[PDB]
Amino acid sequence: KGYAFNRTADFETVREMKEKLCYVSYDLELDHKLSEETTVLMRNYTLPDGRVIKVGSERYECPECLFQPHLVGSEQPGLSEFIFDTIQAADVDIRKYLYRAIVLSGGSSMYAGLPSRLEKEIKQLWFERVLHGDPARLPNFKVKIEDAPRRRHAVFIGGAVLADIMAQNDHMWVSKAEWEEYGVRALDKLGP
Amino acid sequence: FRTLDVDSITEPVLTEQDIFPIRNETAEQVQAAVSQLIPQARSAIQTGNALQGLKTLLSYVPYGNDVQEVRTQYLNAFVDVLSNIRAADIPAFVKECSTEEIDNIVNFIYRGLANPQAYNSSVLLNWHEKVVEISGIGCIVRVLNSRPDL
Amino acid sequence: ATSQVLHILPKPSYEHAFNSQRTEFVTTTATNQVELYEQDGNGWKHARTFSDHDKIVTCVDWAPKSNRIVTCSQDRNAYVYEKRPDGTWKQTLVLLRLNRAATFVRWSPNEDKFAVGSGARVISVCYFEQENDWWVSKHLKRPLRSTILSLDWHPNNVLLAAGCADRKAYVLSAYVRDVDAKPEASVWGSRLPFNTVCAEYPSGGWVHAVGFSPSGNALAYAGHDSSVTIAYPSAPEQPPRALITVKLSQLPLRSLLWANESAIVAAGYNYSPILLQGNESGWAHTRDLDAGTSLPTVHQNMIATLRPYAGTPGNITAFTSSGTDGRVVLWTL
Amino acid sequence: MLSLDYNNIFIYELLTERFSSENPSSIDQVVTDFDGVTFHISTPEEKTKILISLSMKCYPELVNYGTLDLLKQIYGAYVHEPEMGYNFSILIDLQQLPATDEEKEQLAMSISMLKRNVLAAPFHRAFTKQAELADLARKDPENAPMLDKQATSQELMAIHYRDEETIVLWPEHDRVTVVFSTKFREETDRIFGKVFLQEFVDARRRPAIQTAPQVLFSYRDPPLEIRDIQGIQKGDDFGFVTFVLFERHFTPQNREDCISHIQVFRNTLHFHIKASKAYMHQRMRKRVADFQKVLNRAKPD
Amino acid sequence: GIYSEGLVFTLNREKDPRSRMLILKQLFLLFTTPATYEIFYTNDLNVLIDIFIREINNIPDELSDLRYAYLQVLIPLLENTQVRHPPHYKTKCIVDAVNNVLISHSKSSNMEDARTTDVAIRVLEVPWLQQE
Amino acid sequence: MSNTLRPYLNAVRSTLTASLALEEFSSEIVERQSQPEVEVGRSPEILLKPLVVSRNEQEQCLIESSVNSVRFSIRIKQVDEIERILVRKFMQFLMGRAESFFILRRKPVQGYDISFLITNYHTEEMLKHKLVDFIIEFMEEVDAEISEMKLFLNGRARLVAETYLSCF
Amino acid sequence: ASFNVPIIMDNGTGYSKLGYAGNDAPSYVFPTVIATRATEDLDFFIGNDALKKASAGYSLDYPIRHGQIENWDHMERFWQQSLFKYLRCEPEDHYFLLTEPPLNPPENRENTAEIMFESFNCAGLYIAVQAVLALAASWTSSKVTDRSLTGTVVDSGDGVTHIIPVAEGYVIGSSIKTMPLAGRDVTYFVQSLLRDRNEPSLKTAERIKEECCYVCPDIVKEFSRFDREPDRYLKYASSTTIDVGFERFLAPEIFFNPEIASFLTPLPELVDNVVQSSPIDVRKGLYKNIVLSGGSTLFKNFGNRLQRDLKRIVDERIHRSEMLSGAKSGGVDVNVISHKRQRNAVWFGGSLLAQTPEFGSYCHTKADYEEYGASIARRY
Amino acid sequence: PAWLATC
Amino acid sequence: PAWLATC
């Protein structure tokens, strides 16, 4: 667009403006047509130095670069297709219990419109791969994604809960002892 | 992934709003009262006293479920009996009138304005301006909030 | 009938969260920030700013008996603030189970719970659960096919009304058994179970605001159709003995309330409030509350939530408005 | 750049640079010029010597009228045979030059004006025919309409350098006339050219330019005068314009610039149409800026 | 040319319902003269006719004789101009707007309506009165 | 009825100021978003009746109302081809310069000349009566400036012809 | 009409260059500058004309700056002038081959496409980038078919420079890497250096630059030729002589020694990071064919310096990996080439391409824009 | 995965 | 980049 932040600084300011003015597009074609036809969606953001900049399609585009890794330069299916293939690789009897329970974690997941967009993408991917165009039984899918305001610290809360639970028994841990002997190998006790 | 516009799930709500008294099977599915009252307005125009004809024609009003020929004939007779009126007595007629009547009048005026090549629209704009100056924006906001089909 | 503008409030308010002594209050700024103002000498000032949410807020309320504050956010959450023994505050989160953003919130007259109408097809009622340190929320989703616009309470915690997005305004109950509340045999219904969908009372246009008379009967509501309706029911299942509608010429109006068992007040897009008497024998408006109808009045933009004053629970004798252009004002009578 | 140039600025600059300097270079390039004509600036054998070549579409029709005589009269110390067709060629030696005097710049300008130089023998023939016809009328004032009619279709020429654009000409009693038949593809450009031609017609009304020649035009129907030519006629998109000049307008001291102007007529017209489009764009941006000012006034603060 | 271009530029911008009259009287006394016929450039005359038919159709409130003055200054224009001899530029819309303002005249009004109708029918009685 | 311009103007102004009753609204589609419902067209309950006004077939004004935003399309009278081209170019350039107004639309709706768009943030920041007054002033100055531009083009052509015939 | 010769135009922050196809040398090269002020105010000029102007009250300004168009009005005026005065061509009977930076946005792309298709009523148009053409201008014959396509181009425009790792005629959109140096910044630095000691502004600076500015494998181990032989203190005159000092010896090192003017990373490290970000199965070729472009890049010993630096860096990395593993790997071979093309390789490549008949088909037709509109081209 | 059901 | 090979 013309604005450059080549300095090592301003990275935090760009991060702040991203977390402040960003949202996923429930309908990418609709958002593109809106940005191309209307003057709305264009915002003006100030900087710490004092100058001001204008932001447009990038707002709804960066969640697409998240969704489309090929846009960034990586060869991967994405996120919705990734989790879909991961679940399909499991046993059928588990698949349902996974579509009914889906949680998220991390500040990157707080992009506006991400959960419902992911749900719609999963629904479309199922409709395409499995039913091949038979919407007669699509409503009988029962997908229930989960989201909360504490995904920013879900890992921390879980670590605290696990520490409070395991603070009694010291066997499950790896004491300072038994380290010089086979310390590294002790770390293999967690992941076989 | 792909784009297929999945909409079968979470269907919208269209008929729930705009309650429909269309369940009559009289003057809306058979077009009887309309054909009985239109000749009355025509005779009123012929004799000259078009105000009473308009008043009698405004008693019943159709709806916009599926039929458009009957409502188009209604609107044509409407535009005719309106053009047959002079440039006076409209203030008295609107002052001695109800609210739903004025709402239907404005709705039909707009539906007629939607096709200028088939009508005049000048007397229609005049009537609309007079109604606005008499009643106010209430009628406009009521007709704008009426059923999407009429 | 006395224009008594108090503060400018540069940014939009959408609420005023008045206090009991009319000294301090809490309003919004069309942004995640929420401003708590305190009474200065013949003036006011931004005593504090919360700025705890991430997205913009839509509604707040001030519980007098507990000196508590509640606020919703478009981020699908709510916050509750308590005045600590010192001048500081104690904030707590409320993760009301929802899918879409929030639209309105209001405390209960007993200050034991607060209801929240969201942008989804569901309303929620939250209460601080004892024996623990959090709040529990219960849903109401069977009716209200579409989103909702506003809601209002009832003398008793039960019989909460909701003005929805559709052309109808519903009424449900928020009764709970674990809480220390009990219903009462009323004309509105019997045995008041949780949902107990009682009436719908359809109308024209949107439903921007509803209202309960000081008594449990004589419901009212108005919306975008430039019309206000009042229902005087007689039995829960049977239709009402009288459903009096009143249309006018002015622009639509919202945030209505009751200044008396018979008198009613309201305002909104019309830059000045009105005054009307609604009785079972007839409902009609008498006069406005301005010199006549910059602009030739006090407000110069859409009038947001309008709140009552102490007076007497029967007659308030005055009220307050906080337009979207700031310029918070009070009007006698 | 209202009055377009009557030569090739690129060739002029190249010649002025090579002549004023001494360092040669192996040059091999091609250039395009209006009427879809081509120029070649080769230097195959000697880095000092140059071989220029000119390719036009109506070279046979031109030589039919006689142009080689004018070429060998204005040139001959530098003429050359066509190396490979190209419809005309010429050679020059960068070393054997007369001098660095103004004759050098004159020769460079003459070379740069090769297009109008080769497209001038028809007009010269017309003027000579007009002169002898006027002399005849002097010794025979009677039969003016008869002599004019018998000269019509007798002393008349046409050129079709373009696929559809044509230029016809013929003299008459103490005056001469020329006609341009052009095409308009875009409707906006057609309307702009029509209004420009109307203004041209209504331009002689000014007293300061009363001595200018006269001009008329037609949208689709051409005059009956040239109705018999093979050129396309009766075309909605094909517009005809006619200039008529008197004796003075082609005087022995101005006929050169006159023919050059008549040649660049169409290019000037098109360039001015586009410049008027740009002018309307400028007025539009000015007025939308005024609208923005009004809207900001309407806005508070 | 300066006179005509300035006059048309001022008429396109002016909004006073009384000052335009003075310019209209100037136009009348200018066109009535035969020597002045065709003095206005064609394109200028075309846009003048365009703004004339405009101000006639979208005329302001009826409380004004501007329509009568426009018809009075138009009826002699087409008779002593340059658009008379060749295929007329715009006459269909002209007569259409004339008939429109004619039917719009409430014949039950005062003498002003009768005078305007007389002037209009006088305009409509153009020698060629080309139809379709 | 002569002078239809003033009645048409009063009617369009009244209906516009009536439909201009916007209000904050959160999209009930995906998450915590605010989109123009009249533009997206995915909520019939939000979309109100589309109103139309016209004094003649050559001119039209359509308006689509909602709770979150509003759209106002207009097609201006244009009979000549040069007039059509000039109007198209002027309106296209104006819509290209749709960053300082905050209300214009980069592209119009098919079948009309231009389409203004208004939202809730506008009426909250600036007023509305002045906005509609500016819309009207533009509705007239469009044709005013079309005529002025035709006059300027005539003058440019005259100057070009004069300089051409003088250089001749 | 796809049969005549196509016109090749290339606008730039420093110099606009336009001419025809099938030519060994470009045409109409000049510094891309415009000058302007009953009433029209249309008297303006461009190029060397505008440069010589401003003595009679003609203003001046640069249409394009920082590698991005800024004023479409002046850009169209410039194009009209260059197309109807300098070249007596017809935009209808000839196809156009335009070049835009890899960062040009779709708004500007479609604006140019429209202003060219509508105002100039063109017939065939093709917009491309500078990387692929500059690369195609690398090889000499262009017909033996033994040429190579996988390369790493670095174009140093007079206003901005950038690097593109092209692989088999498939441009990359991620590994692209820009830098605002290698342009007029060097001239401004040399001017500020000169204005400090010797008051006698920027014309002489660029002149002495193009005349004598060269590089050195080192600077501090260098400076010794200066301390020893005063012969390096050349004397350049415009109007008197000036002491060169060490500008000719310091200016170009701004690339290998960044953060000296208005921070950045050296060029070897930048190109190494670019090649690493690119896929792994193309680095062996990317390091092989590293072609250059842009006048500011055609220095004396630029290629040798860059090659030595990148080679030592890659050798250190591979030696670290080796001594960590213990085997012996095959040292990758890095090469650099610049064969009388780094000056104006863009136009040469554009003409060499347009010489093919497929150009007439790959172009955009007027009817396409008429039916589809200005939304034909979106992105590479 | 490519067995129209399991795997 | 910090995987001793790819990325």
Ligand SMILES: Nc1ncnc2c1ncn2[C@@H]1O[C@H](COP(=O)(O)OP(=O)(O)OP(=O)(O)O)[C@@H](O)[C@H]1O
């Ligand atoms: N032999 C040379 N050695 C070093 N630098 C040179 C040499 N020749 C020219 N330059 C530099 O190159 C610059 C001119 O660059 P040029 O105009 O060719 O870039 P450009 O192609 O216009 O870039 P863009 O297209 O991005 O504008 C001059 O400022 C000059 O300093």
Ligand SMILES: [Mg+2]
């Ligand atoms: Mg360059």
